[PDB]
Scaffold this active site. Structure first.
Site, PDB file in Angstrom:
ATOM      1  CE1 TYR A   1      10.875  32.113   3.131  1.00 33.04           C
ATOM      2  CE2 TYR A   1      10.630  29.768   3.547  1.00 33.04           C
ATOM      3  CZ  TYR A   1      10.530  30.703   2.567  1.00 33.04           C
ATOM      4  OH  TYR A   1      10.482  30.758   1.249  1.00 33.04           O
TER       5      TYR A   1
ATOM      6  CE  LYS B   1      -0.544  -0.136   5.022  1.00 37.05           C
ATOM      7  NZ  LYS B   1      -0.451   0.946   5.710  1.00 37.05           N
TER       8      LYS B   1
HETATM    9  C1  LIG Z   1      12.015  32.020  -4.492  1.00 36.82           C
HETATM   10  C2  LIG Z   1      10.408  32.381  -4.217  1.00 36.82           C
HETATM   11  N1  LIG Z   1       9.397  33.365  -4.786  1.00 36.82           N
HETATM   12  C3  LIG Z   1       8.497  33.554  -4.174  1.00 36.82           C
HETATM   13  C4  LIG Z   1       7.819  32.549  -3.352  1.00 36.82           C
HETATM   14  C5  LIG Z   1       6.227  32.618  -2.805  1.00 36.82           C
HETATM   15  O1  LIG Z   1       6.077  32.608  -1.610  1.00 36.82           O
HETATM   16  P1  LIG Z   1       4.686  32.833  -0.974  1.00 36.82           P
HETATM   17  O2  LIG Z   1       4.188  31.283  -1.054  1.00 36.82           O
HETATM   18  O3  LIG Z   1       5.292  33.107   0.536  1.00 36.82           O
HETATM   19  O4  LIG Z   1       4.207  33.805  -1.533  1.00 36.82           O
HETATM   20  C6  LIG Z   1       8.462  31.474  -2.970  1.00 36.82           C
HETATM   21  C7  LIG Z   1       7.877  30.337  -2.148  1.00 36.82           C
HETATM   22  N2  LIG Z   1       7.827  30.203  -0.799  1.00 36.82           N
HETATM   23  C8  LIG Z   1       7.745  28.910  -0.019  1.00 36.82           C
HETATM   24  C9  LIG Z   1       7.061  28.593   1.119  1.00 36.82           C
HETATM   25  O5  LIG Z   1       8.005  27.681   1.831  1.00 36.82           O
HETATM   26  N3  LIG Z   1       9.283  27.853   1.371  1.00 36.82           N
HETATM   27  C10 LIG Z   1       9.239  28.396   0.009  1.00 36.82           C
HETATM   28  O6  LIG Z   1      10.050  28.592  -0.623  1.00 36.82           O
HETATM   29  C11 LIG Z   1      10.021  31.191  -3.297  1.00 36.82           C
HETATM   30  O7  LIG Z   1      10.725  30.287  -2.950  1.00 36.82           O
HETATM   31  C1  LIG Z   2      -4.026  -3.747   7.848  1.00 37.50           C
HETATM   32  C2  LIG Z   2      -2.716  -3.746   7.724  1.00 37.50           C
HETATM   33  N1  LIG Z   2      -2.030  -4.921   7.796  1.00 37.50           N
HETATM   34  C3  LIG Z   2      -0.503  -4.700   8.319  1.00 37.50           C
HETATM   35  C4  LIG Z   2       0.142  -3.749   8.024  1.00 37.50           C
HETATM   36  C5  LIG Z   2       1.540  -3.711   8.062  1.00 37.50           C
HETATM   37  O1  LIG Z   2       1.874  -2.814   9.393  1.00 37.50           O
HETATM   38  P1  LIG Z   2       3.417  -2.625   9.634  1.00 37.50           P
HETATM   39  O2  LIG Z   2       4.013  -1.924   8.639  1.00 37.50           O
HETATM   40  O3  LIG Z   2       3.482  -1.945  11.113  1.00 37.50           O
HETATM   41  O4  LIG Z   2       4.019  -4.100   9.402  1.00 37.50           O
HETATM   42  C6  LIG Z   2      -0.664  -2.306   8.164  1.00 37.50           C
HETATM   43  C7  LIG Z   2       0.218  -1.109   8.138  1.00 37.50           C
HETATM   44  N2  LIG Z   2      -0.093  -0.255   9.152  1.00 37.50           N
HETATM   45  C8  LIG Z   2       0.274   1.235   8.666  1.00 37.50           C
HETATM   46  C9  LIG Z   2       1.366   1.768   9.268  1.00 37.50           C
HETATM   47  O5  LIG Z   2       1.107   2.748   9.761  1.00 37.50           O
HETATM   48  N3  LIG Z   2      -0.467   3.102   9.939  1.00 37.50           N
HETATM   49  C10 LIG Z   2      -0.942   1.948   9.341  1.00 37.50           C
HETATM   50  O6  LIG Z   2      -2.193   1.502   9.112  1.00 37.50           O
HETATM   51  C11 LIG Z   2      -2.172  -2.335   7.936  1.00 37.50           C
HETATM   52  O7  LIG Z   2      -2.708  -1.234   7.992  1.00 37.50           O
END
Ligand SMILES: Cc1ncc(COP(=O)(O)O)c(CN[C@@H]2CONC2=O)c1O
Ligand SMILES: Cc1ncc(COP(=O)(O)O)c(CN[C@@H]2CONC2=O)c1O
Ligand SMILES: [Cl-]
Ligand SMILES: [Cl-]
Ligand SMILES: [Cl-]
Ligand code: NA
Ligand code: NA
EC number: 5.1.1.1
Lengths: 382, 385
Positions: free
Chosen positions: B277, B40
């Site tokens: 940031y 999955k």
């Molecule tokens: C270079 C640059 N310009 C403009 C923007 C637009 O930013 P706002 O979405 O804040 O308008 C970002 C993205 N900012 C994202 C937000 O998280 N990190 C980033 O680099 C960016 O990395």
């Molecule tokens: C129904 C079922 N069977 C088997 C597994 C295997 O689990 P392990 O990865 O822990 O072996 C999961 C995964 N469980 C995921 C892991 O995180 N949350 C979930 O539901 C599951 O949801």
């Protein structure tokens, strides 16, 4: 797709267009760039790019060259005259393809100056280059002093040879989401110095730009020729300190909803989900929401994430699992398949992405951007 | 060449030989039981189909998925997986593609009457019988059928559908809440309830091919919980379910995923310079900064801001300040690697790199979430197919 029956992310492109509209009114001296990196912050790169351009964006911004090239290759084509900029480059990247595709490419360093010039030389067409200045963020830009002097120098020589044209000078703020933070003024001062210096040496950029969303919304002095309001275009405020979407005429674009997989009665004292961090206080009903952290529901919102189900806000009961989580429905008995609305614009009583951010100890940018590929996107008002 | 190009920024390297070795090691650990390869969520971020193929090659006789779409995609893979592998899915909602699942011969889980009605309807319309697994809620309080009247009624409806030739109950199953905490009293309580609910169903006339309750931590620590089939998901990917259970090496396991990127920038900066940031980091004196071109859109959790580890130029570095959407910075202490130099965020750990568990700790989460949410913008590269 019957995939929408489990869950979906509805993307209202009319809301996106209205947001672009509103941001254009807020920055009347400048062109607007639609920042569509990271699959348009999880909303879908090409559909959001088309909508933004239709609403008056004249620039598109991406991080990677692959993202920008995908926009150029879209069919049907976006207008030939829209400028597309990308900035996250590493050595050996597809500089020649970018030049041939007429992308504006950011350059922060000599290595990248050399590679783009080499690519322009081999392509037989000039590059469009934007020089990034590190004005205080300490991330991707060129430092002031010698580094900038050298970079501006090499750019002038490449111009002299007809290999490129410096089309812009730009930077990015560290703390614009905290209004009055002293770094904001310091960065603007440094931006003015570094750009003055480049122009005095002979560079003639079409655009100077520094503003992200919070600067676009709160600092008209930082608009220059071009604004880059990414998160605001998706209708999400950069921070509660800046304000709400409604304070700026904005409307969240994404609505995240699912259909209940199971509604069941359980006794008191019954553990719920991994680690049994919730235990039913008495006899009650549980609802299974078929979305988990693989879908982008942050595990940090365990015990706290809000969801509208059957007329009331519920909260996550105990641990979010990979594919699902549980809510205590308090005795209510909605039908299986009943709608659970995790977030949206908020006008139907549902939570917003900012509520999820608070529940998960993060920012709303992360919430919308990391909604997984397993959640289908449904575009409305295309 | 377009393949060769996206990997230059970053890649998630998937060692299928490590996965096959992990499946062999798990089969040794549960000699009485068939092994289900839980694939999955795009094989917990590792790639559904390639992992499914490798797991089957290594002796898995069942594949497990959450959604029907995941399971149907395995049936449709070209080249096909063997026709005789059983594929089970369990995360269903009203109106889902029950008929397509029945026609594709999938085992489908049912926890509720609605679903019992829908799959019986679909089997009736398809003219072929369904393979149905009844899920018992033995204490997890999540997807199963409650004991008592709900189970009585569900078992009853199943028998009637068997009588009409519409289905066969091929399994009875459940899932543990706290198996990652060895000796937690809910474990025994769930096993006792599982035994009772399954005894009850069989005495009423149900004849399942498999009974199963074990996830990875139960598979590794509870031989009494193996029954006919084990479902060790995270362990197949070489990752331990918790440090309380142990390390991968304790179980003969090797992490399958290695996450690495190429430095985008190396630059000198003065002291007193804010980094990223909010300026949560400030250079203490003159130094070099390295730009790692991966961010929270690529699945680098924002919660690892100021703590995430990465191997760069021979030493562990840690994230300086806030992780951004597409990148983060590290203080390289004066070192001057070349742009393009490898930054190894996690892997099996034998080359001095951090593990996914180190990232989990840095981000206040579990290693499951780290590997599973590595973003689609990171290309996967498959070795030892
Ligand atoms: C270079 C640059 N310009 C403009 C923007 C637009 O930013 P706002 O979405 O804040 O308008 C970002 C993205 N900012 C994202 C937000 O998280 N990190 C980033 O680099 C960016 O990395
Ligand atoms: C129904 C079922 N069977 C088997 C597994 C295997 O689990 P392990 O990865 O822990 O072996 C999961 C995964 N469980 C995921 C892991 O995180 N949350 C979930 O539901 C599951 O949801
Ligand atoms: Cl910078
Ligand atoms: Cl919790
Ligand atoms: Cl359950
Ligand atoms: Na800067
Ligand atoms: Na259970």
């Amino acid at each position: 797709a019957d995939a929408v029956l489990r869950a979906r992310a509805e993307i209202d492109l009319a809301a996106l267009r209205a947001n672009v509209r509103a941001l254009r009114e807020r920055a009347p001296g400048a062109a607007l760039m639609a920042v569509v990196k990271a699959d348009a912050y999880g909303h879908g790169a090409i559909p959001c790019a088309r909508a933004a351009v239709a609403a008056g964006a004249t620039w598109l911004g991406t991080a990677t060259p692959q993202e920008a090239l995908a926009l150029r290759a879209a069919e049907p084509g976006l207008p030939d005259d829209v400028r597309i900029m990308c900035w996250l480059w590493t050595p050996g990247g597809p500089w020649r393809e970018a030049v041939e595709a007429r992308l504006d490419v950011s350059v922060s360093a000599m290595w990248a100056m050399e590679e783009v010039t080499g690519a322009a030389r081999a392509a037989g067409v000039p590059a469009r280059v934007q020089l990034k200045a590190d004005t205080g963020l300490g991330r991707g830009g060129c430092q002031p002093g010698a580094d900038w002097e050298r970079l501006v120098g090499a750019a002038l020589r490449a111009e002299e040879e007809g290999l490129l044209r410096v089309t812009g000078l730009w930077s990015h703020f560290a703390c614009a989401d905290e209004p009055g933070h002293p770094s904001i003024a310091a960065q603007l001062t440094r931006f003015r110095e570094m750009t003055a210096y480049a122009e005095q040496r002979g560079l003639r950029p079409e655009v100077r730009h520094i503003a992200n969303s919070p600067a676009t919304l709160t600092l008209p002095d930082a608009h220059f020729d071009l604004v880059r309001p990414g998160i605001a275009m998706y209708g999400v405020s950069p921070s509660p300190e800046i304000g709400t979407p409604a304070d700026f005429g904005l409307r969240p674009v994404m609505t995240l909803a699912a259909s209940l997989a199971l509604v069941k009665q359980v006794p008191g004292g019954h553990g719920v989900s991994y680690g049994h961090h919730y235990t039913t206080p008495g006899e009650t009903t549980l609802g299974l929401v078929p979305l988990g952290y693989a879908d982008g529901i942050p595990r940090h919102a365990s015990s706290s994430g809000p969801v509208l189900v059957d007329g009331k806000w519920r909260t996550v009961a105990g641990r979010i699992a990979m594919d699902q989580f549980v809510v205590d429905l308090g005795g209510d008995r909605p039908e299986p398949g009943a709608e659970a609305v995790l977030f949206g614009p908020g006008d139907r009583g549902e939570p917003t992405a900012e509520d999820w951010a608070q529940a998960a100890g993060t920012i709303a940018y992360e919430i919308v951007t990391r909604i997984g590929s397993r959640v289908p996107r449904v575009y409305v008002n295309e």
